[PDB]
Curated annotation (Swiss-Prot), chain A:
This is Small ribosomal subunit protein uS2. Pfam families: Ribosomal_S2. The lineage of its organism: Bacteria, Pseudomonadati, Pseudomonadota, Gammaproteobacteria, Enterobacterales. One of its GO terms (cellular component) is cytoplasm. Required for ribosomal protein bS1 (rpsA) to bind to the 30S subunit.
Swiss-Prot record, chain B:
It comes from the Bacteria. GO terms for cellular component: cytoplasm; cytosol; cytosolic small ribosomal subunit. GO terms for biological process: cytoplasmic translation; regulation of mRNA stability; regulation of translation; ribosomal small subunit assembly. The keyword Glycosyltransferase does not apply. This is Small ribosomal subunit protein uS8. Belongs to the universal ribosomal protein uS8 family. InterPro entries: Ribosomal_uS8, Ribosomal_uS8_CS, Ribosomal_uS8_sf. It comes from Escherichia coli (strain K12). One of its GO terms (molecular function) is rRNA binding. Part of the 30S ribosomal subunit. Contacts proteins S5 and S12. The lineage of its organism: Bacteria, Pseudomonadati, Pseudomonadota, Gammaproteobacteria, Enterobacterales. PROSITE patterns: RIBOSOMAL_S8. The keyword Nucleotidyltransferase does not apply.
Swiss-Prot record, chain C:
One of the primary rRNA binding proteins, it binds directly to 16S rRNA where it helps nucleate assembly of the platform of the 30S subunit by binding and bridging several RNA helices of the 16S rRNA. Binds to its own mRNA, stabilizing it 5-UTR and preventing its translation. In the E.coli 70S ribosome it has been modeled to contact the 23S rRNA of the 50S subunit forming part of bridge B4. In the two 3.5 A resolved ribosome structures there are minor differences between side-chain conformations. Gene3D superfamilies: 6.10.250.3130, S15/NS1, RNA-binding (1.10.287.10). GO terms for cellular component: cytoplasm; cytosol; cytosolic small ribosomal subunit. This is Small ribosomal subunit protein uS15. It holds the Pfam family Ribosomal_S15. Part of the 30S ribosomal subunit. Forms a bridge to the 50S subunit in the 70S ribosome, contacting the 23S rRNA.
Length: 218, 129, 88
RNA sequence: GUAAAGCGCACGCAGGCGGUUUGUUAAGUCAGAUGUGAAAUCCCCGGGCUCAACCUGGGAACUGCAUCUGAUACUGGCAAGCUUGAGUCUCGUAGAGGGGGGUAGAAUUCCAGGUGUAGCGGUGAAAUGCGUAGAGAUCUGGAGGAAUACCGGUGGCGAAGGCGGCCCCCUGGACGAAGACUGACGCUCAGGUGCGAAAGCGUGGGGAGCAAACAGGAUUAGAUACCCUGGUAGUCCACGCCGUAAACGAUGUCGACUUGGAGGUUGUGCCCUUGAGGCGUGGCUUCCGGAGCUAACGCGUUAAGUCGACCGCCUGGGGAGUAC
């Protein structure tokens, strides 16, 4: 397991005949991710990544999952990276042209209450909109500054962020996901057989890829 | 029942190729072999073996290429209860040539092209594209 | 349908060796057994159609076995029929 | 599968198809040659009418049949086997499978008697009806017929239709276990033969309950109905007949492949079996669903997916499954 010997396998017995080629056993009534053959996908997943990362490539990081969120919000903050850990909308990729605009408000309204342009007019007015920003930074505050379409994307577990891969593969965006047992490794052209959660597991691989990303650009 | 042995091999092949499988098992026979040979000598299968001395099997290895299987299509032709025999100037051309037509001649069971040039016709077998 | 001794008995009487019940002879004989004997269970009841249906099986199965013999060997056939007066 | 279309289901003659090895034959098969396939059409190249239509030289072709000479993979014949198909033996397991004969209890109806006295029954209300000749209720005894609560279930069995108390007799199939044996004896099947819910028919029994018909009472504008009170065939039995049904999974039989999940029923191997229990490995069977299929709904290893042997059937709707 190289070092990732802190998650091994997961997903009781629901599994998926597709993720089959990525199991060692099923002890304790649950398949065991063959980390012995995961090592390739492990460190290598970052290989093809650093390449596009060096070109200042726009790499996204999805993961709405409650546990991942708090950790993913920092993952992409490694430098020139973007994150999306709050319910992947249905268009922030395939129909960006629209959502990309909704972001504007987020900007201004933010910089507004951010500087001096906020405590003006009536209080009720501001008070009512002093929240809108928040909700916006959740589903955009992380993928906002993104200029246009991301060079690629890296999502935690396929199943959950199903829509993420869908809208992507439609545009032709590389799929860097960590599919395990239940997960479906078909939407991900970059198979990464590994747990779909576990704080100790996610974090380990979260900042993991970031390496080749930050180490990629010169 | 197994009134048609040949068909079994053909079908067992495409079916496996679809489910993405290394090789395929099945009791071999004199003809099943010669036919399987051509499938190899022509580029459709890695290799093949015949385990069991008393009861012969057939470790027919399936071949693939990119994100798809090599055997794009294979159907039976001279099926039983409806045999098919063609002359030297009758032998068809599978997929305008990009395919193969296994034919059994009095000189052996080779491909259409080979049998055709040899100047002899024979009972067709299948049209492995 | 039949009995241990009843069966085993007719077996040896037609088996060149032992435990060779597969023998065509043993079969033809073993078949006719419940056959020429079930006649009673059918001479009466009559309405017992379900069990009747099966009666035919051991009759037909026996039929094919005989026709087979006539093809795989004339003698055995023309010699076996007599021991049971079969084929009239 | 639902659009037209799977015989209601079995057995099986003819016919069609036939697991595997060797040898042999050389019939089908293929190669060659030889006859012959009239000429004219057609076609190719080329000629001749000023071109063309038209005419014409030569060749190609005439899909074919016959004979001869080979070739032998494949189909067939034949000879010898071979065991995985099929089957026989052994031992067990499960079962509302079938025919026969008994039998048990609950209830209904009717009869007789006691106690008892003004109702009961039924409805949306009502009425018809049963009650002072004493009902109803309740108790005691008796007669008779039909059906078998609970178990009982996504359950089980059967070819289909279908099959439920218990007991016995006679009997058909299915499944596992490890072997023993026969050695392709197989798969399908026009016609044919047989089985076939219910109703219906005949003869003769039986007849409690239910109930077409029929009679009353209501309802209604009418009510040849729905509701009520009665009630005949029939329903039950034996023997014979009639062959139909949404005889439905609306999906023919047989064999081989093809990701998975959960549950039921019944069998068996191994296991601290110590133990309920763990690991398997068969038959049948529910529901969910992937690939793919599908016009969609949906089907999905019990396929409507991928294939092979055989059969049945469809060809617009109405007329008409009628007429003859
Ligand atoms: Mg209709
Ligand atoms: Mg129809
Ligand atoms: Mg049917
Ligand atoms: Mg001519
Ligand atoms: Mg031969
Ligand atoms: Mg009747
Ligand atoms: Mg009658
Ligand atoms: Mg059944
Ligand atoms: Mg389904």
């Amino acid at each position: 397991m190289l070092k990732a010997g802190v998650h091994f396998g997961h997903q009781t017995r629901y599994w998926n005949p597709k993720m089959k080629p990525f199991i060692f056993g099923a002890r304790n009534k649950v398949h065991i991710i063959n980390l012995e053959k995961t090592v390739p996908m492990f460190n290598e997943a970052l290989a093809e990544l650093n390449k596009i990362a060096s070109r200042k490539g726009k790499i996204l990081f999805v993961g709405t999952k409650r546990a991942a969120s708090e950790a993913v919000k920092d993952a992409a903050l490694s430098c020139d990276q973007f994150f999306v850990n709050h319910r992947w909308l249905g268009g922030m990729l395939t129909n960006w042209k629209t959502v990309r605009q909704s972001i504007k408000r987020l900007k201004d309204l933010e910089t507004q209450s951010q500087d001096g342009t906020f405590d003006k007019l009536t209080k009720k007015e501001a008070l009512m909109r002093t929240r809108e920003l928040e909700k916006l930074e959740n589903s955009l505050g992380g993928i906002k500054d993104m200029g246009g379409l991301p060079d690629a994307l890296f999502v935690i577990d396929a199943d959950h962020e199903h829509i993420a891969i869908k809208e992507a593969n439609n545009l032709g965006i590389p799929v860097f996901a960590i599919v395990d047992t239940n997960s479906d490794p078909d939407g991900v052209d970059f198979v990464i057989p590994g747990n779909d959660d576990a704080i100790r597991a996610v974090t380990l691989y979260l900042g993991a890829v970031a390496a080749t990303v930050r180490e990629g650009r010169s | 029942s197994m009134q048609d042995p040949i068909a079994d091999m053909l079908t067992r092949i495409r079916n496996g190729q679809a489910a993405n499988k290394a090789a395929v098992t099945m009791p071999s026979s004199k003809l099943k072999v010669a036919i399987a040979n051509v499938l190899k000598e022509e580029g459709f299968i890695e290799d093949f073996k015949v385990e069991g001395d008393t009861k012969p099997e057939l470790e027919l290895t399936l071949k693939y290429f990119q994100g798809k299987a090599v055997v794009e299509s294979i159907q039976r032709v001279s099926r039983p209860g409806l045999r098919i025999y063609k002359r030297k100037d009758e032998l068809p051309k599978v997929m305008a040539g990009l395919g193969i037509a296994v034919v059994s001649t009095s000189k052996g069971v080779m491909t259409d092209r080979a049998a055709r040039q040899a100047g002899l016709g024979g009972e067709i077998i299948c049209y492995v594209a | 349908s039949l009995s241990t001794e009843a069966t085993a008995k007719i077996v040896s009487e037609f088996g060149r060796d032992a435990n060779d019940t597969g023998s065509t002879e043993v079969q033809v004989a073993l078949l006719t057994a419940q056959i020429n004997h079930l006649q009673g269970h059918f001479a009466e009841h009559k309405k017992d159609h379900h069990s009747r249906r099966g009666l035919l099986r051991m009759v037909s199965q026996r039929r094919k076995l005989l026709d087979y013999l006539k093809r795989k060997d004339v003698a055995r056939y023309t010699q076996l029929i007599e021991r049971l007066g079969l084929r009239r």
